[PDB]
Amino acid sequence: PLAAGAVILRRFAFNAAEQLIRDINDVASQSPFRQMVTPGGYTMSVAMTNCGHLGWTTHRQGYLYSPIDPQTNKPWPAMPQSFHNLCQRAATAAGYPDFQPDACLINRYAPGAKLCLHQDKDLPDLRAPIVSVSLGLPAIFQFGGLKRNDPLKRLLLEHGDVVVWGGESRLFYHGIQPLKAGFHPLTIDCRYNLTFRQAGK
DNA sequence: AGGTAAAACGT
DNA sequence: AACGGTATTACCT
Ligand SMILES: O=C(O)CCC(=O)C(=O)O
């Protein structure tokens, strides 16, 4: 195990990946990738979009799961069936058979892009896991503990890898180190990540 | 009283 | 470049 309640399913999504990427492109044709601006005024290096009922976003006052894309003023695209099916299968393999996600944050990393150590914090009256799917170029994933200075595990995540955490590890600090440039036959020059959560009801 | 920003420069 | 300061506060509910 990666941690209590956490596991990495290596290449779990490899067979599903071509279809997942087609569906990323479809989602992004409606809610485009955008680099969000933090409350403090800095533009994130990762470009993001969302699908499902709820999408993660920043704005002046903090972070928010929102049912509407603040850029388009339309609902986020519905969660693709390919995404939902893959998520369900991975969650079940990881020991979370009852997971019902309603939120998928899609990350796009260009060379140099990073995601500094953070926690995916608890949502009110909800304790569902996180399912996190890697596509395209490889990245170094940091996975720590409850405190920022708890020692980090560093794990290369390659195309098709799925990481799941929850329960005792649900609030662990994690992140991505600056992406190395490279080639991948399906994504060409980037890495995508899918982050599934239950954020509503 | 407690949660959230920093999911973002210096050594 | 891996580690850690910063929020050691300010501003909300
Ligand atoms: O890209 C990854 O593997 C992790 C992404 C992540 O932590 C997030 O979007 O919250």
Ligand SMILES: [Mn+2]
């Ligand atoms: Mn995260």
